Design a binder for this molecule. Structure first.
Ligand SMILES: CC(C)[C@@H](C(=O)N[C@@H](C)C(=O)O)N1Cc2ccccc2C1=O
Ligand SMILES: CC(C)[C@@H](C(=O)N[C@@H](C)C(=O)O)N1Cc2ccccc2C1=O
Lengths: 162, 162
């Protein structure tokens, strides 16, 4: 089900959040670390239903950001649906220490034949969100590879359509 | 998470199934009624992981259909993941008996302002799969409207990206 969240604006007068209009709906594109957004448990992928009571259905990215910018008081209220496009998939590394997919800009671009990823039916055109609980949104590809490399045999990732 | 299914080829030498390659993965596009696919509970949206042991990752629509066509013997085995893109949303009709969205060819094309659909954050470019348990895949728009009309106030629908 959805849920309500109350959060306050920081010194610089922001919440550390980017919103994207996708199919006439507003979605969290990035949540900056240690921000008011972070504390109340907002994460990349969350759907924004209302902002201060008003429905977001139909709003552009620009409209959604302009509402928050001129939003009145200390406290903004938001009705959220938790990552509705969330898919978790558990994979196992082979002898070479690989689960078997290629990615660019944190998005899966190809699957390796007869790998663990192929076995479990991983899909391309999906962004990597987490790896074993560690959020990888807004990291460089090399930083993602480090996390993959420093993982154990069991590799659980969370994905979403691009 | 996944599961195995065994099914036999019918008199006309088919299973009554269409498969579509989506993001280097095979998916059920349509399940013809009273077919071997229908028995054993295949439905539009299911992901095909293996066909007769072999991983489907990377296969084209043509490749996937060609495997089944020349597949040896009475019995085909398939590893399936049940509708992984499934999203349910419950809505309530207004005074005019409307939840507030437009659709064409069983796909949501627009949301009505300040409706129940807007309130609950329904998205366009999503196919309607069920309505209160009733499957509406392969129905005409008018037949869908009948089911909507003959629904009560509470309207639960299942959707998927187009
Ligand atoms: C094996 C390589 C090609 C692959 C990889 O580490 N694969 C993982 C998912 C596995 O199988 O453990 N990487 C690492 C990397 C770093 C920077 C930019 C792109 C990539 C990429 O595709
Ligand atoms: C309000 C009307 C135009 C709408 C509708 O009854 N939808 C409900 C779910 C609502 O608006 O709540 N319909 C009915 C129909 C029949 C055949 C083809 C398209 C449509 C369509 O968009």
């Amino acid at each position: 089900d959805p849920r309500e969240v109350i959060l306050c604006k920081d010194q610089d007068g922001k919440i550390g959040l980017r919103l994207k209009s996708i199919d006439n709906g507003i979605f969290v594109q990035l949540v900056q670390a240690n921000s008011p957004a972070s504390l109340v448990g907002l994460r990349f992928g969350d759907q924004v239903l209302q902002i201060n009571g008003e429905n977001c259905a139909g709003w552009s990215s620009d409209k959604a950001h302009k509402v928050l910018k001129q939003a009145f008081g200390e406290k903004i209220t938001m009705t959220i649906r938790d990552r509705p496009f969330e898919r978790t998939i558990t994979m196992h590394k082979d002898s070479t220490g690989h689960v078997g997919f290629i990615f660019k800009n944190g998005k899966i671009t190809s699957i390796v034949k007869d790998s663990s990823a192929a076995r479990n039916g991983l899909l391309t055109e999906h962004n990597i969100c987490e790896i074993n609980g560690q959020n990888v949104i807004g990291l460089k590809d090399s930083q993602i590879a480090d996390i993959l490399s420093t993982s154990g045999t069991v590799v659980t990732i969370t994905i979403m359509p691009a």
